[PDB]
Amino acid sequence: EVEALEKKVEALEWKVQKLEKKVEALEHGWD
Amino acid sequence: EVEALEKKVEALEWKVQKLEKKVEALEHG
Amino acid sequence: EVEALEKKVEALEWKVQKLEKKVEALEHGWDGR
Numbered sequence: 416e417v418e419a420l421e422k423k424v425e426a427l428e429w430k431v432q433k434l435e436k437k438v439e440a441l442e443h444g445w446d
Numbered sequence: 447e448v449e450a451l452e453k454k455v456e457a458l459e460w461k462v463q464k465l466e467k468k469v470e471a472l473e474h475g
Numbered sequence: 476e477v478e479a480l481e482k483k484v485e486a487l488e489w490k491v492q493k494l495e496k497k498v499e500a501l502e503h504g505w506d507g508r
Binding site: 416417420423424427430431434437438441 | 448451452455458459462465466469472473
């Protein structure tokens with residue numbers, strides 16, 4: 416059960432860092 | 447303790463999915 | 476182990492909430508957008 420939780424958190428941490436990059440690009444008008 | 451964590455992870459999982467869809471829209475129209 | 480999950484989860488909540496604010500601001504064009 417906590418092993419399953421840990422995989423879920425690892426994937427969230429990934430999705431969230433990708434979201435952070437996308438949102439910063441949008442905020443800053445990057446590129 | 448663990449059950450409470452499971453609730454928090456589900457809540458986060460849902461919010462991140464909504465974020466992904468909205469950000470994706472934002473990148474198009 | 477479980478203590479570590481709990482801190483990771485807490486971090487995520489702060490970041491996810493920051494992301495929602497930013498994304499809503501972008502979507503509604505708040506404060507010039």
